[PDB]
Write a protein that holds these residues in place. Structure first.
Motif, PDB file in Angstrom:
ATOM      1  N   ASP A 155      -0.015  -7.086  -4.479  1.00 17.29           N
ATOM      2  CA  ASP A 155      -0.038  -5.774  -3.784  1.00 17.29           C
ATOM      3  C   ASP A 155      -1.141  -5.746  -2.730  1.00 17.29           C
ATOM      4  O   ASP A 155      -2.315  -6.051  -3.052  1.00 17.29           O
ATOM      5  CB  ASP A 155      -0.254  -4.638  -4.776  1.00 17.29           C
ATOM      6  N   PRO A 156      -0.770  -5.388  -1.471  1.00 21.11           N
ATOM      7  CA  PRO A 156      -1.733  -5.238  -0.356  1.00 21.11           C
ATOM      8  C   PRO A 156      -2.872  -4.247  -0.675  1.00 21.11           C
ATOM      9  O   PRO A 156      -4.005  -4.429  -0.206  1.00 21.11           O
ATOM     10  CB  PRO A 156      -0.868  -4.732   0.810  1.00 21.11           C
ATOM     11  N   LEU A 157      -2.569  -3.224  -1.476  1.00 26.68           N
ATOM     12  CA  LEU A 157      -3.583  -2.272  -1.942  1.00 26.68           C
ATOM     13  C   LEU A 157      -4.683  -2.905  -2.805  1.00 26.68           C
ATOM     14  O   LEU A 157      -5.733  -2.293  -3.036  1.00 26.68           O
ATOM     15  CB  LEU A 157      -2.919  -1.136  -2.698  1.00 26.68           C
ATOM     16  N   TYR A 161      -6.457   6.157  -4.002  1.00 24.91           N
ATOM     17  CA  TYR A 161      -5.097   5.831  -4.386  1.00 24.91           C
ATOM     18  C   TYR A 161      -5.071   5.900  -5.885  1.00 24.91           C
ATOM     19  O   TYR A 161      -5.952   5.314  -6.540  1.00 24.91           O
ATOM     20  CB  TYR A 161      -4.729   4.456  -3.864  1.00 24.91           C
ATOM     21  N   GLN A 162      -4.108   6.678  -6.400  1.00 24.72           N
ATOM     22  CA  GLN A 162      -3.944   6.966  -7.842  1.00 24.72           C
ATOM     23  C   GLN A 162      -3.347   5.795  -8.617  1.00 24.72           C
ATOM     24  O   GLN A 162      -2.474   5.067  -8.107  1.00 24.72           O
ATOM     25  CB  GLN A 162      -3.052   8.217  -8.096  1.00 24.72           C
ATOM     26  N   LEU A 174      -5.454  -2.159   4.864  1.00 18.10           N
ATOM     27  CA  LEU A 174      -5.419  -1.093   3.925  1.00 18.10           C
ATOM     28  C   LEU A 174      -6.710  -0.957   3.128  1.00 18.10           C
ATOM     29  O   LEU A 174      -6.894   0.062   2.501  1.00 18.10           O
ATOM     30  CB  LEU A 174      -4.229  -1.265   2.973  1.00 18.10           C
ATOM     31  N   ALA A 175      -7.605  -1.955   3.164  1.00 21.52           N
ATOM     32  CA  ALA A 175      -8.872  -1.863   2.429  1.00 21.52           C
ATOM     33  C   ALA A 175      -9.769  -0.818   3.058  1.00 21.52           C
ATOM     34  O   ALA A 175     -10.753  -0.434   2.473  1.00 21.52           O
ATOM     35  CB  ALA A 175      -9.626  -3.215   2.372  1.00 21.52           C
ATOM     36  N   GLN A 187      -0.933   2.465   9.226  1.00 22.30           N
ATOM     37  CA  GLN A 187      -0.925   1.511   8.152  1.00 22.30           C
ATOM     38  C   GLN A 187      -0.745   2.189   6.808  1.00 22.30           C
ATOM     39  O   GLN A 187       0.184   1.843   6.045  1.00 22.30           O
ATOM     40  CB  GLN A 187      -2.168   0.631   8.185  1.00 22.30           C
ATOM     41  N   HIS A 188      -1.611   3.150   6.509  1.00 16.90           N
ATOM     42  CA  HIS A 188      -1.460   3.867   5.243  1.00 16.90           C
ATOM     43  C   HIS A 188      -0.114   4.562   5.068  1.00 16.90           C
ATOM     44  O   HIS A 188       0.469   4.453   3.992  1.00 16.90           O
ATOM     45  CB  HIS A 188      -2.654   4.762   4.929  1.00 16.90           C
ATOM     46  N   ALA A 189       0.352   5.243   6.127  1.00 15.41           N
ATOM     47  CA  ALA A 189       1.657   5.915   6.143  1.00 15.41           C
ATOM     48  C   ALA A 189       2.804   4.946   5.797  1.00 15.41           C
ATOM     49  O   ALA A 189       3.674   5.284   4.996  1.00 15.41           O
ATOM     50  CB  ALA A 189       1.922   6.582   7.483  1.00 15.41           C
ATOM     51  N   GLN A 190       2.784   3.765   6.409  1.00 12.16           N
ATOM     52  CA  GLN A 190       3.809   2.754   6.177  1.00 12.16           C
ATOM     53  C   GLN A 190       3.791   2.327   4.707  1.00 12.16           C
ATOM     54  O   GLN A 190       4.838   2.305   4.052  1.00 12.16           O
ATOM     55  CB  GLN A 190       3.605   1.546   7.114  1.00 12.16           C
ATOM     56  N   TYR A 191       2.604   2.037   4.178  1.00 13.41           N
ATOM     57  CA  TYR A 191       2.477   1.749   2.764  1.00 13.41           C
ATOM     58  C   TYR A 191       3.051   2.871   1.880  1.00 13.41           C
ATOM     59  O   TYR A 191       3.920   2.621   1.043  1.00 13.41           O
ATOM     60  CB  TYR A 191       1.035   1.393   2.382  1.00 13.41           C
ATOM     61  N   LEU A 192       2.601   4.101   2.093  1.00 10.16           N
ATOM     62  CA  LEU A 192       3.105   5.262   1.354  1.00 10.16           C
ATOM     63  C   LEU A 192       4.664   5.484   1.363  1.00 10.16           C
ATOM     64  O   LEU A 192       5.289   5.630   0.304  1.00 10.16           O
ATOM     65  CB  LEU A 192       2.344   6.534   1.764  1.00 10.16           C
ATOM     66  N   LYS A 193       5.248   5.540   2.557  1.00 12.81           N
ATOM     67  CA  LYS A 193       6.695   5.703   2.763  1.00 12.81           C
ATOM     68  C   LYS A 193       7.535   4.624   2.080  1.00 12.81           C
ATOM     69  O   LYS A 193       8.642   4.891   1.581  1.00 12.81           O
ATOM     70  CB  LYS A 193       6.994   5.694   4.262  1.00 12.81           C
ATOM     71  N   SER A 194       7.011   3.406   2.084  1.00 14.88           N
ATOM     72  CA  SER A 194       7.667   2.267   1.479  1.00 14.88           C
ATOM     73  C   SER A 194       7.357   2.103  -0.022  1.00 14.88           C
ATOM     74  O   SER A 194       7.943   1.234  -0.657  1.00 14.88           O
ATOM     75  CB  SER A 194       7.350   0.994   2.273  1.00 14.88           C
ATOM     76  N   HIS A 195       6.451   2.924  -0.573  1.00  9.33           N
ATOM     77  CA  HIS A 195       6.169   2.957  -2.004  1.00  9.33           C
ATOM     78  C   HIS A 195       6.189   4.358  -2.637  1.00  9.33           C
ATOM     79  O   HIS A 195       5.164   4.765  -3.193  1.00  9.33           O
ATOM     80  CB  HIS A 195       4.810   2.332  -2.312  1.00  9.33           C
TER      81      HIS A 195
END
Length: 119
Positions: free
Chosen positions: A1-3, A117-118, A10-11, A34-42
């Motif tokens: 995971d990139p997170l 991030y939860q 994303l760091a 970057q964060h938005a793309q991560y969120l929308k895709s997860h």
């Protein structure tokens, strides 16, 4: 995971603000993207967005200011198509200073919003 990757763009999880401002400066567009793309895709991923202020000014003032900072970041990601259900904007006001000094350097470090991030 990139997170979990410390070399991933994303760091970087903090947005900083000018004195008395809740404007998310233009320089933060690619980070929001970057964060938005991560969120929308997860869809399962939830982020807590915590607004912080420096210590100057009233408790109530800075609580309100911190809120507006967290909302400014949420809004910028909202606009990029993240679901409201994956985002929560809260304020710590001046209560959790990250730098504990009483000068321009410490204050600037504390006029800040973090993407938390939860689990």
């Amino acid at each position: 995971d990139p997170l979990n990757d410390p070399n991933s763009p994303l760091a970087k999880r903090s947005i900083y603000f000018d004195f008395d401002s809740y404007s998310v400066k233009d320089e933060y567009q690619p980070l929001m993207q970057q964060h938005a793309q991560y969120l929308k895709s997860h869809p399962q991923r939830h982020v807590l967005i915590q607004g912080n202020t420096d210590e100057r000014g009233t408790s109530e003032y800075n609580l309100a200011l911190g809120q507006k900072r967290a909302e400014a970041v949420r809004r910028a990601m909202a606009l990029l198509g993240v679901n409201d259900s994956q985002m929560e904007a809260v304020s710590l006001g001046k209560e959790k200073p990250q730098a504990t000094g009483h000068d321009e350097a410490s204050w600037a470090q504390n006029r800040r919003a973090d993407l938390v991030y939860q689990q």
